[PDB]
Subunit: 26 residues, 2 copies
């Protein structure tokens, strides 16, 4: 459970950061 | 322990997609 939790929340930072970079690109 | 590892590896994806996305963007 704790590895799955940390991983997923990190996977949310991953999505944020692509998104903030492609908004800034567009 | 394992939470640091999975976190550092998701942290590497974090740099990878941000430098991929800036590489594509610019």
């Amino acid at each position: 459970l704790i590895v799955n939790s940390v991983l997923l929340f990190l996977a949310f930072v991953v999505f944020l950061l692509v998104t903030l970079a492609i908004l800034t690109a567009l």
